[PDB]
Amino acid sequence: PEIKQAVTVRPGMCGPGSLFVGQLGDWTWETVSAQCDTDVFAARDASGNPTYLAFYYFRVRGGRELHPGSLTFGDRLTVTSGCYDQGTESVLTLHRIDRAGSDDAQRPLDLHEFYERPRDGSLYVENFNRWVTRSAPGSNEDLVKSSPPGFRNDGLPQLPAAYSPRAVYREARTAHTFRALDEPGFRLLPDTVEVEHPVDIVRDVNGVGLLYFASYFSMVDKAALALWRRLGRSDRAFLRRVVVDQQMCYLGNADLDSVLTLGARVRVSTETPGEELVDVVISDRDSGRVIAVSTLHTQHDA
């Protein structure tokens, strides 16, 4: 039983920051709760420790016709949501977003449609989430895999082998990009940036004292802005950027006194002017960990 709902775009789920991905994550927790007969918000492991359904791999796919920067107050959307079986320790949640008028907004989720040929005018969200607990109270390092009792993955529809987010994130942690460096039609610019980012305790921290999943998207855009400025491009042009595809892998969290490093590089298209691929790696130098990788497929007019 897929879920189909009418949404009107609110101030808390749009704009050039991370509010839309924050709202999508709330929707994911509601969708897993409904489909897996589990209260995700208050989940505890068999032993009684809180268990968080942590974001691990996050993709948002759009296009010139509908992307996250298209959305403004009062836009009417149709949202179709559903979970896919990834066993007892993980779960995949898909959301399709259409403009509520649109031809065929009533169509069900179509994996073929999500993994192979996304349609122009729809937005596609993939959230792969993993149950975790803390390994020590107040530590945000070395989180441990978990599963709350009664988590019902059984019955959920299955992905075919071709559609594996696991294959995708395994390659991205190795390559530090989601788009192979040897992919034709792009040139790697020499200009790169490295930004020191102390954890912002007033803006980066969630209600359980971890770094907030949506803050990782804010940190990647801070890196992307720093590279944009290194390229001599304007702050107003940054706000016109169209992100047609963004992938994020959350390899680690971090303690709230950490100083993170945000590294960014870009490949510009040889074929299409104003098209580029930006890669961002978030490091925690003091613990020697890479804690995130993101790739943004971007169209601009700077």
Residues within the interface to a second copy (CB under 8 A) = 8-19, 22-23, 25-26, 29-30, 39, 41-43, 50, 52, 71-75, 201-209, 212-214, 218, 221-222, 225, 235-236, 238-239, 256-257
* Binding footprint of ligand KGA, residue count (CB under 6 A): 17
Contacts (Cβ under 8 Å, ≥6 apart) of 298: 241, 242, 243, 244, 275, 276, 277, 278
251 part of the interface to ligand KGA, by CB under 6 A: yes
Q: How many CB atoms lie within 10 A of CB 91?
A: 26
11 part of the interface to ligand KGA, by CB under 6 A: yes
Query: Which residue's CB is nearer to ligand KGA, number 210 or number 224?
Result: 210
Q: Which of 18, 32, 35, 55 binds ligand KGA (CB under 6 A)?
A: 55
- Residue 119 to residue 113: CA distance in whole angstroms: 7
Binding mask 15-54 for ligand KGA (x = CB under 6 A): -------------------------------------x-x
Tokens of 63: 């296009």
Q: How far is CA 196 from the centre of its chain?
A: 22
143 part of the interface to ligand KGA, by CB under 6 A: yes
Is residue 94 classed exposed, middle or buried when 0-12, 13-18 and 19+ CB atoms within 10 A define those classes?
Answer: buried
Least Å distance, CB 154 to a second copy, is: 23
Least Å distance, CB 289 to a second copy, is: 21
Tokens of 200: 């912002």
First to last CA, the chain: 45
DSSP 152: -
Q: Which of 4, 44, 119, 145 binds ligand KGA (CB under 6 A)?
A: 145
DSSP 220: H
Residues of the binding site? 55, 130, 251, 253
Applying CB under 6 A, the residues found at the interface with ligand KGA are 11, 52, 54-56, 130, 132, 143, 145, 206, 210, 212-213, 250-253
